[PDB]
Design an enzyme around this catalytic site. Structure first.
Site, PDB file in Angstrom:
ATOM      1  N   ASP A 112      36.927  42.092  43.964  1.00 19.74           N
ATOM      2  CA  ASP A 112      37.972  43.085  44.205  1.00 19.74           C
ATOM      3  C   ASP A 112      37.557  44.472  43.724  1.00 19.74           C
ATOM      4  OD1 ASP A 112      38.930  43.784  41.517  1.00 19.74           O
ATOM      5  OD2 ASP A 112      39.656  41.704  41.408  1.00 19.74           O
TER       6      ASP A 112
ATOM      7  N   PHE B  34      35.782  34.501  52.881  1.00 20.85           N
ATOM      8  CA  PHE B  34      35.408  34.754  51.497  1.00 20.85           C
ATOM      9  C   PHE B  34      34.807  36.145  51.367  1.00 20.85           C
ATOM     10  CE2 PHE B  34      34.410  33.486  47.243  1.00 20.85           C
ATOM     11  CZ  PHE B  34      33.229  34.162  46.920  1.00 20.85           C
TER      12      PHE B  34
ATOM     13  N   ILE C 227      38.272  31.089  41.389  1.00 19.33           N
ATOM     14  CA  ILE C 227      38.015  32.529  41.502  1.00 19.33           C
ATOM     15  C   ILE C 227      39.271  33.393  41.329  1.00 19.33           C
ATOM     16  CG2 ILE C 227      35.966  32.272  42.952  1.00 19.33           C
ATOM     17  CD1 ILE C 227      37.807  32.920  45.372  1.00 19.33           C
TER      18      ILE C 227
ATOM     19  N   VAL D 133      46.437  28.561  42.629  1.00 22.44           N
ATOM     20  CA  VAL D 133      45.079  29.002  42.330  1.00 22.44           C
ATOM     21  C   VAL D 133      44.337  29.353  43.614  1.00 22.44           C
ATOM     22  CG1 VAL D 133      43.097  28.461  40.883  1.00 22.44           C
ATOM     23  CG2 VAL D 133      45.173  27.098  40.657  1.00 22.44           C
TER      24      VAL D 133
ATOM     25  N   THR E 268      50.811  32.918  40.813  1.00 18.62           N
ATOM     26  CA  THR E 268      52.144  32.445  40.442  1.00 18.62           C
ATOM     27  C   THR E 268      52.400  31.077  41.059  1.00 18.62           C
ATOM     28  OG1 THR E 268      54.518  32.721  41.013  1.00 18.62           O
ATOM     29  CG2 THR E 268      52.947  34.098  42.245  1.00 18.62           C
TER      30      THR E 268
ATOM     31  N   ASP F 100      52.186  46.266  48.308  1.00 17.55           N
ATOM     32  CA  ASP F 100      51.547  45.930  47.036  1.00 17.55           C
ATOM     33  C   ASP F 100      50.069  46.277  47.035  1.00 17.55           C
ATOM     34  OD1 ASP F 100      51.515  45.118  44.377  1.00 17.55           O
ATOM     35  OD2 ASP F 100      51.436  42.959  44.832  1.00 17.55           O
TER      36      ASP F 100
END
Ligand SMILES: CN1CCN(c2cccc3nc(-c4n[nH]c5cc(-c6ccc(N)cc6)ccc45)[nH]c23)CC1
Ligand SMILES: CN1CCN(c2cccc3nc(-c4n[nH]c5cc(-c6ccc(N)cc6)ccc45)[nH]c23)CC1
Lengths: 255, 298, 256, 297
Positions: free
Chosen positions: B86, B82, B10, B17, B14, B127
């Protein structure tokens, strides 16, 4: 939110406490050996230009680790190395790579050992790395300076750093209290002034309540030139700290 | 890791996963962030260290819960609650008629509650962008990706590298301030707020100077009256063109009087005067807040 | 000599073994009713395999603590209870039923491997802290302050204490020591007309005033027992082993 | 388990082995009890479950520390502090000389402190025998092997089976009592105390009836005056021979007047038997020291 944060730091410093008497329950290592280790970590920080906060965090990690784990004298430095590595990762913008930490130990330990100790310390500390420090409380106190004085700030930081070296007696004081004593003592030494009313209101600590810690800190300050460990004095005679370690301590606090 | 069934990939990153997974014993659906450990060169990444250590201090309904850390041989897994997608994808899906205003108000209210909690716990996110904000079918939105997040009991030094994608970056950062403050999170949220209302990025800069100038063209070139200290800041140039501040009624047409007031306070130039998350929650804009459920295309 | 120290130690440990009072709200798929059904079923399984009452109480304590930090889907709730009963039997029973027996009672809805894996998971989640204080243990301790012993009172106290296991609301918000104290007084009052004795007031420090809120709830549970959807405990306590105490009519008022 | 170096096997058991091991990162020397997990048939053994759960509540200098539990795939390891040998081997090594009395006094004092702590925390050990008692070079002795141990907030039911090797088993158990009490641990400790003093088991029975009779021959056959209820107990027979109680001065010759008094109170028939706490206040310990043993390693 600066009030919210001081409040929250006061909450968390009571929870991040190591065991005050852990060194007695420790078979092979002593306060002197810890003193040597911490002094060495100061050098490493100077060698790699690490923040003061990184030093304070690393020592907090070491005390908490040693509060629940028996370590042999030959492995004490491996604990400190892993602690400094973890503190750098948490606090530095770019930490030194692991190879750097292996080299300051003069190849007494391997990369694998250091990385395995990193894992073990994370397990033992349960990833609870964001510990409050004397440094953080000093920084918050410095915002109540009328007006700012860099010589006071440097000397406060110097005294606070000296507290890291000697488990007896400083393990039995909260960072907020050590910070308070360091601020007053530095303020008193440079400008002749005392723990201000603004900080009394913010912290709730009186000059009476700081007195026990203050008397220890004053005694450490007076004996600093005779201490077997000297890396902090050497560090604080630099221009960046206005040579504050060469200042004369007060003969009396008049409390 | 034996009791987890992998459902699907999903997310890619960097250091590793993210998989959708299922606890085989309890049935709990989970997000697993896998971190491969290079055990010769680096050890546990700084991003994992910060995100684990800070997140486990942050239990709040509008901050994604870290459920577990499975730390082993040569792999580190972070187990999270979960969520379903987004905000970026939800924004894209809602292009041919916008996120309804009641849902936008809901989302901003929740995001400020998540942020206020962070800040009260001396955590800077650093961020906040739409793809780091996760939503569910029941109308919840939560802060995610605390890899760049930092504790600020000691003030956090800005860098010359790395983070806040350019579009949500605050003017003080662009002008080279030395320390972050909580104002940078509020700025980003202001940009996200506007982007929900207008269906476009507020300041889509192609570069640092271009980013700055897009802000200047919309909000006006800042001076010593509007922002005491601007002209002394490292990357400030007196050569900067002087644009005029334009009406918010034209920047965010669909917003009412209260909405414009809040946004202007969130995009205030001087970080000292920019509205705090707590103060923003007490704004009359939120006086009639509800919690609509969206229609996600899952 | 040591029953003061042990009571004191049990009072210390019951504050630490507390589950989260409001955990069921934060739980997406399961409810109090479903928990009620599970616990009622565990009573049957205990009767089927002749298990100690303590085993039941421990198992429920394990389930509430597990569910305080783990989301479970309705179809796995019974697997949690099975593993909990298995672990409680191992802890408390002289010889527990073999694992195959626990797979048996679930009507093959779960596998041997599932049950054994859930056992590992619950041990991890509870961090091997299985020696939890229970209402049963505190009742046992209080029974030593009976002047003189009365088996009908003991059976009714045990009956009421066991009923408290079924309803998370309101019994999750009371300490075992307090529920025990209320069950003892209520049974004592129902059978002999006497009240919470002064010896127990000195031992526990609880007054009849301090027990009142829990007493209130327990009395109401006692009155409504015949109407409750779950009946396994009433059935169990109409046996001659328990002097048919589940047939004793409760007082309509407590006169406090 | 990756940070542990297996040094040597130091112990064999029913559910697994005990190894001496070294933490490679810290240098800590440890005892690792390995438990193989049959993951088809049984799961985590009841012994491990009780031992882990009860021992982690028992932090005391005279109770062996459980340091960690490494619970994984198909193996369960218990990590303990390492001690140097058990009391049985130390007794065997001391046969041509005895354990000096000051060390015996020290050991009993420490064992009672360990036991008192267990009992105050509602834990019954139930298996106190010399090979379950661990000693070090510094003069410490600690309780170990809590596999049979039980919480007694609710009274612990007696078995048909499995228990306390015969020689340290208390009379009530032999006479078929329904519940254990803390008295059974005190009885065992009395037997161990006498064994240290005399260099021989006090009651080395070949069988249950033989075990009882050896106790009767030394302490006298108990009656309703000495132990109210004896004659009604399940395994009591009126056909039991009636022996007379003999002098403790001949049962434990080397003991002084105070030592004899303590032992007789620990071997009292009616489980009126002295508590661990009450035993610690006995004048026998009014000059206790902490000598170091000659461990022949
Ligand atoms: C860019 N997008 C993000 C959303 N992705 C996505 C799609 C569909 C379902 C998704 N579910 C998640 C998710 N649930 N929980 C999470 C927790 C973190 C987390 C990770 C780290 C921290 N520190 C906190 C939370 C990240 C992602 C998720 N992400 C999903 C698609 C790719
Ligand atoms: C039969 N004997 C026993 C003593 N053995 C032995 C010899 C030499 C050195 C020894 N060290 C130990 C030991 N240290 N720590 C332990 C903890 C337990 C433990 C195990 C379980 C629990 N519950 C608590 C502690 C068992 C044994 C030991 N045992 C040793 C030789 C063989």
């Amino acid at each position: 939110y600066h009030e919210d944060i001081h409040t929250y730091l006061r909450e968390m410093e009571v929870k991040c406490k190591p065991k005050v008497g852990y060194m007695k329950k420790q078979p092979d290592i002593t306060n002197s050996m810890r003193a040597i280790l911490v002094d060495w970590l100061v050098e490493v920080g100077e060698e790699y230009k690490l923040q003061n906060e990184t030093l304070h965090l690393a020592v907090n990690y070491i005390d908490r680790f040693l509060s629940s784990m028996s370590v042999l004298r030959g492995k004490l430095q491996l604990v400190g190395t892993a602690a400094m590595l973890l503190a750098s990762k948490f606090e530095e913008i770019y930490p030194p790579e692991v190879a750097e930490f292996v080299y300051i130990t003069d190849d007494t330990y391997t990369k694998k050992q250091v990385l395995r100790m990193e894992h073990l310390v994370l397990k033992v500390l349960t990833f609870d790395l964001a510990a409050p420090t004397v440094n953080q409380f000093l920084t918050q106190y410095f915002l109540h300076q009328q007006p700012a004085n860099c010589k006071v700030e440097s000397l406060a930081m110097f005294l606070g750093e000296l507290s890291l070296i000697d488990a007896d007696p400083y393990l039995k004081y909260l960072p907020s209290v050590i910070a308070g004593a360091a601020f007053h003592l530095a303020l008193y030494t440079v400008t002749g002034q005392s723990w201000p009313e603004s900080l009394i209101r913010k912290t709730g600590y009186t000059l009476e309540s700081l007195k026990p810690c203050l008397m220890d800190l004053h005694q450490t300050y007076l004996k600093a030139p005779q201490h077997a460990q000297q890396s902090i004095r050497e560090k604080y005679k630099n221009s960046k700290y206005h040579g504050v370690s060469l200042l004369n301590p007060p003969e009396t606090l008049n409390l | 890791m034996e009791n987890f069934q992998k459902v699907e990939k999903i997310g890619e990153g960097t250091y590793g996963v993210v998989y959708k997974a299922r606890n085989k014993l309890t049935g709990e659906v989970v997000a697993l962030k896998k971190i491969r450990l290079d055990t010769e060169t680096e050890g546990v990444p700084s991003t994992a260290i910060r995100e684990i250590s800070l997140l486990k201090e942050l239990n709040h309904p509008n901050i994604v819960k870290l459920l577990d850390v499975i730390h082993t041989e040569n792999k580190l897994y972070l187990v999270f609650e979960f969520l379903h997608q987004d905000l970026k994808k939800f924004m894209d899906a809602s292009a041919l008629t916008g996120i309804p205003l009641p849902l936008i108000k809901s989302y901003l209210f929740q995001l400020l509650q998540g942020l206020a909690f962070c800040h009260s716990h001396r955590v800077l996110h650093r961020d906040l962008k739409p793809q780091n904000l996760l939503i569910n079918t029941e109308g919840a939105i939560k802060l995610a990706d605390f890899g760049l997040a930092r504790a600020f009991g000691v003030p956090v030094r800005t860098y010359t590298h790395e983070v806040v994608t350019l579009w949500y970056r605050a003017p003080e950062i662009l002008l080279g301030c030395k320390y972050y403050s909580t104002a940078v999170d509020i700025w980003s949220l202001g940009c996200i707020f506007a982007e929900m209302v207008t269906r476009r990025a507020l300041f889509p800069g192609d570069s640092e100077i271009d980013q700055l100038f897009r802000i200047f063209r919309t909000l006006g070139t800042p001076d010593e009256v509007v922002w005491p200290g601007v002209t002394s800041m490292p990357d400030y140039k007196p050569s900067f063109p002087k644009w005029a501040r334009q009406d918010f009624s034209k920047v965010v047409p669909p917003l009412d009087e209260d909405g414009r007031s809040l946004l202007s306070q969130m995009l205030h130039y001087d970080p000292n005067k920019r509205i705090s998350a707590k103060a923003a929650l007490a704004h009359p804009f939120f006086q009639d807040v509800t919690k609509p459920v969206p229609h996600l295309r899952l």
